[PDB]
């Protein structure tokens, strides 16, 4: 039961982590197209640089609390979209069923 | 450059337990870390393990 709890955890860790990066990934995303707009330009590009430094290090974080999938990427806004996908497939199925499976053992062990 | 010093200090707090906790991870943060290093490299590290090598010494023989 302790084993499925740390699994529990880690998956738990995995997703908050996550999060943020896909919070910043959709500002940039905002600041690129109003770039691509534009195209005064001095500042977006400043404001692009804020964004991708605060990407880079929600990359990084979400990287410091992974264990697996997420170790082929890194930390770099051309590996965004798998961090996003690892998202999903957390918050659809990994985290789900890793919460019932511990929900299960739990009742297994006290009833 | 700018990412990987970024990407740099953060190995730093990920290993630190306190040194340098209260900076941050932006370039306005790099003097203090730079200064952080140099103490782990001038004191902290030759003292330290003068006291590990002194304690192994008088303790244990």
């Known amino acids: 039961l302790t084993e499925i709890h740390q699994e529990l955890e880690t998956a738990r860790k995995q997703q908050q982590s996550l999060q943020p990066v896909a919070l910043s990934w959709e500002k940039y995303?905002?600041?690129?197209?109003?770039?691509?707009?534009w195209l005064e330009i001095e500042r977006v590009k400043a404001e692009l640089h804020r964004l991708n430094i605060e990407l880079?290090?929600?990359m990084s974080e979400a990287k410091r609390v992974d264990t697996g999938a997420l170790v082929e990427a890194g930390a770099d806004l051309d590996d965004i979209?798998?961090?996003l996908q690892r998202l999903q497939e957390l918050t659809e199925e990994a985290?789900?069923?890793?919460?019932?499976r511990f929900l299960d053992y739990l009742n297994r062990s006290s009833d």
């Open 56 to 58: 880079t290090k929600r």
């Open 95 to 100: 985290l789900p069923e890793k919460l019932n």
């Open 81 to 83: 979209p798998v961090y």
């Open 29 to 37: 995303q905002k600041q690129e197209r109003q770039l691509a707009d």
